[PDB]
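thread from #wetlab-drylab

HS: before we spend reagent money on co-crystallization trials with S-adenosyl-L-homocysteine, can we at least see a predicted complex? here's what I'd submit
DV: go for it
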Amino acid sequence: HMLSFRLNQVAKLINNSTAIADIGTDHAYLPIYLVQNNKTKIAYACDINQKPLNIALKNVEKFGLTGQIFTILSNGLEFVKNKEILNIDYVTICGLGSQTILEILKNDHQKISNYIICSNTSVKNLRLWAVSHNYLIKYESFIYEDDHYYWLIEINKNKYSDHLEELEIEFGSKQFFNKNSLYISYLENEISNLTKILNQINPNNIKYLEIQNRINKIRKYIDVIR
Ligand SMILES: Nc1ncnc2c1ncn2[C@@H]1O[C@H](CSCC[C@H](N)C(=O)O)[C@@H](O)[C@H]1O
C-alpha cells in the first residue's frame, strides 16, 4: 500500500466527493490514492514548499492523473480565494502540529465543507475552534504509528457543534474514546510525566498548581471513558 496507517484512516472518511484539497501534501500519495479509488473526482495537492511539490507533480504524471490532480503552491488555505478553485468537500491536513493547523484555519473559507485533520500534537485548540464556530466534530480517533502519536479529528461545518463538556473539549468527545485502552494508556503516561515534574519544581511556582490541575483533569476524564 502507498499510504501509511494514519493516511489510510483519513481516506476511509472520504467518499463520493467532487473535490478535495490536501494541505501539506508532500508527495501527493493521498490525493493520488483518493483519485485512484474514486473517492474524489479531482484533488488539489497543496504545499507551502515548491521542492516536494516537484516530486508530487512527477508522481501525478507517472500514474496518469494530471487531469484530475493539480499541484498548488500555497501557505495553507490562501489559494482557496482564487476564482478557479471549486467548492471543496474535504480539506485534509495531515502531519502538522495543532498550532500550525489552527493558524491555517484562520483562512477558512465558505468554499470548504469539511476538514479531516491528523495532527501530531493534541488538538484541544482545534476542538475549541470547532465549538466556538458551532461546527460538528463528526469523528475523532487516536493513532500510534512509527513511535509517534496522532490526533485525528473530522469537522463538518454544515452541522451544529455538539454541546461538549469542558473535559471533552480538552481530551476528546467521550463518544469517540469510550473504552479506548490505547488513549487511556497514553493519558496515564501523561500523568506520570507530570508527576516527575511536580517532584522537581517549587510548589510556590504557578506551574506546580497548573500541573497539579492538569493531572486531576486527566484523571477525571480517564474515569469517564474507562
Ligand atoms: N503552512 C503550510 N501550508 C502548506 N503546507 C505546509 C505548511 N507548513 C508545512 N507544510 C508542508 O506540510 C508537509 C508536512 S509533512 C506531511 C506529509 C503528508 N501530508 C503526511 O501527513 O504524511 C511538508 O511537506 C511541508 O512542506
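DV: Residues 206-225 form the longest helix (20 residues).
HS: ok that's useful, forwarding to the group
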